[PDB]
Amino acid sequence: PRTVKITASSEETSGENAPASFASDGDMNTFWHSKWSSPAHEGPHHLTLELDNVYEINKVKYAPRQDSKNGRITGYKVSVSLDGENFTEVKTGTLEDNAAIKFIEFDSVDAKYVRLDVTDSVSDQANGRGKFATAAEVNVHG
Numbered sequence: 001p002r003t004v005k006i007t008a009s010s011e012e013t014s015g016e017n018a019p020a021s022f023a024s025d026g027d028m029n030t031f032w033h034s035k036w037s038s039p040a041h042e043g044p045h046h047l048t049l050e051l052d053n054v055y056e057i058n059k060v061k062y063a064p065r066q067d068s069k070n071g072r073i074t075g076y077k078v079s080v081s082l083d084g085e086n087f088t089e090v091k092t093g094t095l096e097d098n099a100a101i102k103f104i105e106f107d108s109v110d111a112k113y114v115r116l117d118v119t120d121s122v123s124d125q126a127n128g129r130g131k132f133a134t135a136a137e138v139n140v141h142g
C-alpha cells in the first residue's frame with residue numbers, strides 16, 4: 001500500500017522542520033511534530049494516511065521520534081475510511097513509553113484512509129503530557 005499523502009491536525013515548520021509528510025518515509029532521523037511554536041496546536045492530535053487505492057489492511061506500524069520523547073504516542077485510536085470523510089473505528093489501545101517501533105494489529109479491513117488519533121502522549125517536560133505528537137514513521141500493511 002503506497003501512502004499518497006499524510007495529513008495531520010497540525011505540523012511544525014517554524015521552530016524546526018517537522019511537517020506531516022516526514023512521517024511517510026522510513027528515515028528514522030526525520031519526524032512529524034505537531035505544531036509547538038506559537039501559536040501552538042496542543043491537541044487533539046491526529047494523522048491520516050491516504051493510500052493510493054483501497055487495500056485490505058490489518059496492521060499499523062508506528063516508529064516513535066528517535067531523538068526525543070516529546071510527542072511519543074502512548075494511547076491511540078485507529079479508524080479506516082473508504083471516502084476520507086466517514087471513518088470507522090477498528091482498534092483502540094496503549095503503547096509502551098519507549099522509542100521502539102510499535103505495531104497496531106486488528107482484523108483485516110478495507111481502507112483507502114487510515115487515521116491515527118492520539119489519545120495520550122508523553123514528553124520530557126514536567127507539564128507536557130498530551131501537548132505534543134510526533135512520529136518518525138506511520139505505515140500500513142495487509
Ligand SMILES: CC(=O)N[C@@H]1[C@@H](O)[C@H](O[C@@H]2O[C@H](CO)[C@H](O)[C@H](O)[C@H]2O)[C@@H](CO)O[C@@H]1O
Nearest residue numbers: 015016033036068070071123124125126132
Ligand atoms: C526537560 C525539558 O524541558 N527539556 C526541554 C525539551 O523538551 C526541549 O525539546 C524541544 O521541545 C519542543 C516542544 O517544547 C519540541 O518537541 C522540540 O522538537 C524539542 O527539541 C528543549 C528545547 O530545545 O529544551 C529542553 O531540553
Ligand SMILES: [Ca+2]
Nearest residue numbers: 022027030136
Ligand atoms: Ca521519517
